[PDB]
């Protein structure tokens, strides 16, 4: 039998499964959330200042 | 700005060309000192200017071995009038490519860009060729590079075998290796290269070839720069007499257990070169008739998968890796042979098959009329499709004006192609077979047959 | 080499900080029990700054010390904040270091190749205890005077040299102004030695890397320090700041004895003399013996055992996750150590004598037992094999 680690190199499929035991993903197509990240972080930088 | 599906509003369009444009003619001009200027007009918006010299590998005394490879490598670098920085900056500023090449008989410097930069191209190329200053540290860096290159150049068996053939089969001047040797790589410096260039880059050995330039403008630009070179009688060409020999050398013994294949080749010699045009063209037609194959290629069908070699060898003995015929016409001398790759269990059979095939070609009456007609058509079609690019036409003009002194129109070559018949190829092949055998091998040498016994299988 | 510069963070000027803080490789499964070293570093820095600013308003004399402390609290802008931060940050610093020590005991961090780190840690602990005890005196209350008397006169139990060293230590015949000024100078000096020992401790750890909750080889899966453990340290620091400020602002006297607001009076004795809450285990072990020489020389086995743990050389598995019996012994030792702590603050009669004499026996049976699991379990692969 072929190694599990080599069957994933010569088979560039595009259907990928992550580990959702901790973090869920947004459905594909949805925008990013960079602005909300800056929004959340400024509220603590104020306090530290 | 609008999307690209909608035309820009404020552009001015120069008028087009007619569907029929009468092609121009090659205008060849020689200066009093022997400098030959040639040019031709073209239709595309691009130009191509070359500079070809008669020097080469054969003009190489044993104290200056390996000089041609560096002369190729030190191509466009620090001149007497500008640095290497400025040269690279100029070339990239106008947006042009630049390249240099060296072979066993003639040097080639090329430079192409758009057609509105012709004076800059001419001036820069003439300066980079006529006034080079060889600086020791740049040459040292190039020497390190070529050391690393030659140390690892054993990944091409084809050219190594061809070099072995050309080294064993000859004895005179033409036996030198175009690729250099570690002795040369530890013997070369700036002074040697400067003296070599000073000795061999005279006036009667230089020709300018352009592809898309009016003759008068190019002449006006290149007259003040090249007319000052002194005139000097050209030294007499060296000589080499064909001498049948044999070559063997096993691969590094760390790569034998991998089942490395067996390689070898055969060869013969032609008294004529390029001055006997009919014989050379017949040899070209014969080479296209034999064809060959690679067992792995995926290119065009028209490559000759219904040629003699492919059908009558590979489809009959599948054990082969690769069969192919090759030739290398020189000035006053030619070469022909066959190179084959197969495992270490079919070797002597391969020699028998290839010698049988050569003798089958030799004997009269063995070639069908369809075969000759197909070879003729393929050869002429290949020539005409080759002549499309501007690079090819500039190189052709330069090489032809070096060899014959005048350009020979394509119609003449086509006429000479049509004159080929069965008796002519028969007689020419008879002349091929009437010469001593050259052989060489590579890979697992311990199985290749002897020279004398195989030689006896042929004629005198 | 890189014949032209790339980054400021890899230049020679910042090479040390970069290599030991930013790009240093750490295991990727470190938990929240690995933040207390940094947290203790911040506690030490807080102590140093607050002390350098208290020592601008304090006068070391027997007539003036009490009134100068009260002057600080009543007449200087924000001085009450400085005094409360100092007097409670000592307690926070001890709490954090105790948690650090018990982390080290759990996942067996003293074993090879990390015994130099353990030995330097023990030395640091001694310096900490000396500094805190010397600095509890300068306010010059009742407990300051009588605690100094008891503890520093416990050094005449030694044979012939005893009275001489006690009298040389006290600078005279009793605890008076000379002892006060002496202790003030020692208190201002020791924390810089503490800083130096901490830096040496960190270098000794960085020359082999840290352990992990598994106790296995960890050179195949590592991540850098920034930004992956910087943010975890940040979480820890903010929680610690909330806790510290709950102490400072809404209950600043719960962790002290009321008797230190009475100026020192050498004639009357308090009815119940004890030191701070973080010396009570040692104090209970010390009074557990009905003999001066034995009582004083029973502290020495404590430090000898703590300093000689690393040199047993048969145990092969580090983390207590795969060691049930040693894990149970760890929890039972923790309970017994808390019991010593509670006993150290009680009057000496029944039924506290027996309960003060047995827990020392357990506290020493811990350091006696552990090699026996080492041997009895070195031969475990041969019995349970499949």
């Amino acid at each position: 039998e072929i190694p599990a680690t080599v069957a994933a190199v010569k088979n560039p499929s595009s259907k990928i499964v992550y580990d959702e035991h901790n973090h869920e993903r947004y459905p594909p197509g949805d925008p990013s959330k960079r602005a909300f990240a800056y929004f959340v972080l400024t509220g603590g930088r104020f306090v530290y200042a | 700005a609008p999307p690209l599906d909608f035309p820009l509003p404020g552009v001015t369009l120069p008028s087009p060309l007619p569907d029929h444009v009468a092609p121009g003619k090659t205008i060849v001009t020689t200066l009093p000192n022997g400098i030959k200027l040639a040019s031709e007009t073209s239709a595309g918006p691009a130009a191509s200017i070359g500079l070809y010299v008669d020097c080469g590998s054969i003009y190489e005394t044993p104290l200056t071995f390996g000089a041609t490879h560096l002369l190729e490598r030190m191509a466009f670098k620090s001149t007497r009038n500008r640095t290497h920085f400025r040269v690279v900056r100029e070339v990239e500023a106008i947006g042009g490519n630049v390249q240099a090449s060296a072979s066993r008989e003639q040097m080639g410097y090329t430079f192409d860009a758009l057609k509105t930069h012709v004076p800059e191209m001419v001036e820069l190329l003439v300066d980079c060729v006529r006034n080079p200053v060889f600086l020791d540290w740049e040459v040292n860096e190039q020497l390190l590079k070529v050391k690393a290159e030659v140390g690892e150049a054993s990944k091409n068996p084809q050219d190594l075998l061809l070099e072995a053939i050309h080294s064993a089969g000859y004895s005179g001047a033409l036996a030198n290796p175009l690729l250099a040797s570690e002795s040369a790589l530890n013997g070369l410096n700036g002074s040697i290269l400067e003296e070599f260039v000073a000795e061999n880059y005279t006036a009667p050995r230089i020709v300018l070839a352009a592809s898309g330039v009016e003759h008068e403008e190019l002449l006006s630009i290149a007259e003040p720069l090249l007319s000052d070179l002194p005139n000097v009688p050209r030294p007499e060409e060296p000589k080499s007499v064909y001498t049948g020999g044999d070559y063997r050398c096993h691969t590094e013994s760390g790569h034998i257990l991998n089942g490395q294949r067996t390689h070898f080749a055969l060869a013969f010699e032609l008294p004529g070169g390029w001055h006997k045009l009919k014989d050379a063209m017949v040899l070209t037609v014969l080479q296209m008739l034999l064809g060959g194959g690679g067992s792995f290629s995926a290119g065009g069908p028209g490559k000759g998968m219904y040629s003699r070699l492919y059908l009558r060898v590979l489809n009959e003995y599948p054990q082969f890796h690769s069969i192919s015929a090759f030739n290398n016409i020189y000035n006053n001398t030619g070469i022909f042979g066959i190179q084959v790759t197969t495992g270490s269990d079919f070797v002597s059979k391969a020699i028998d098959i290839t010698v049988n095939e050569l003798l089958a070609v030799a004997t009269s009456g063995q070639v069908d009329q369809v075969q000759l007609d197909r070879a003729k058509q393929a050869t002429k079609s290949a020539i005409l499709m080759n002549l499309e690019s501007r690079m090819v036409v500039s190189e052709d003009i330069g090489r032809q004006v070096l060899t014959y002194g005048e350009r020979k129109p394509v119609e003449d070559f086509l006429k000479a192609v049509d004159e080929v018949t069965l008796k002519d190829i028969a007689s020419i092949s008879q002349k091929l077979i009437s010469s001593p055998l050259t052989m060489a091998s590579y890979g697992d040498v311990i199985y290749v047959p002897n020279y004398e016994s195989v030689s006896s299988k042929f004629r005198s | 080499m890189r014949n032209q510069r790339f980054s400021l963070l890899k230049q020679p000027i910042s090479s040390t900080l970069n290599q030991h803080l930013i790009d240093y490789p750490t295991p990727s499964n470190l938990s929240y029990w690995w933040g207390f070293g940094s947290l203790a570093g911040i506690c030490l820095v807080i102590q140093i700054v607050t002390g350098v600013f208290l020592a601008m308003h304090y006068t070391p004399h027997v007539d003036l010390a009490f009134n100068s402390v009260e002057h600080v609290m009543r007449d200087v802008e924000g001085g009450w904040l400085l005094r409360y931060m100092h007097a409670n940050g000592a307690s926070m610093f001890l709490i954090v270091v105790h948690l650090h020590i018990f982390r080290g005991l759990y996942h067996a961090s003293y074993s090879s190749p990390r015994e130099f780190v353990r030995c330097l840690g023990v030395v640091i602990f001694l310096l900490m205890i000396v500094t805190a005890f010397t600095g509890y005196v300068p306010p010059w209350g009742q407990m300051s005077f009588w605690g100094a008397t008891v503890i520093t006169s416990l050094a005449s139990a030694i044979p012939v040299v005893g009275d001489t060293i006690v009298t040389w230590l006290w600078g005279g015949f009793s605890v008076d102004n000379a002892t006060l000024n002496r202790f003030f100078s020692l208190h201002h000096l020791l924390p810089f030695i503490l800083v130096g020992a901490s830096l040496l401790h960190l270098a000794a750890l960085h020359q082999y890397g840290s352990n992990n909750p598994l106790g296995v080889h960890s050179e195949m899966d590592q991540i850098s320090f920034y930004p992956y453990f910087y943010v975890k340290d940040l979480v820890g620091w903010v929680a610690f700041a909330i806790f510290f400020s709950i102490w400072i602002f809404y209950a600043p006297n719960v962790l002290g004895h009321p008797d230190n607001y009475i100026p020192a009076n050498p004639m009357p004795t308090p009815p119940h003399i004890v030191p701070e809450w973080y010396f009570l285990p040692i104090h209970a072990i010390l009074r557990s013996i009905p003999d001066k020489s034995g009582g004083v020389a029973a502290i020495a086995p404590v430090f000898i055992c703590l300093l000689a743990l690393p040199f047993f050389k048969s145990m092969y598995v580090r983390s207590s996750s795969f060691r049930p019996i040693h894990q149970g012994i760890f929890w039972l030792l923790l309970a017994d150590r808390l019991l010593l702590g509670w006993i150290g603050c009680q009057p000496v009669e029944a039924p506290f004598v027996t309960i003060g004499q047995i827990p020392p026996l357990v506290f020493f049976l811990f350091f006696a037992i552990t090699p026996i699991p080492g041997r009895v379990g070195r031969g475990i692969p041969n019995s349970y094999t499949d």
Partner: protein, 117 residues
Amino acid sequence: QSFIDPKKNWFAAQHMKAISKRLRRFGLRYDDLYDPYYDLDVKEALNRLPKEVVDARHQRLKRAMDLSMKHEYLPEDLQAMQTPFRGYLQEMLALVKREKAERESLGGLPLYQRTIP
């Protein structure tokens, strides 16, 4: 410059004599005092010179340093066979600096940059 020239000015001549005397004492040339750690152009100029010249420079430096350690000077005869102010480094240094300037004019990046100490 005019007054820097020895043959006109009359101090300048005294300055030249003093410097030549001080250099002849230890048997080294004025171009030895340059240092590859100062400029990094001296590094390149010495990286382009032939090997024999750099080797002679190293031997002269070692000789002078041994003399200075021992607190003594070369004998009078070897002080007569000396010749300071016979350069081997100035033209190459000018070439390297001129190439540096010409590269600075046309954009580009420097070929070697000093480390931040």
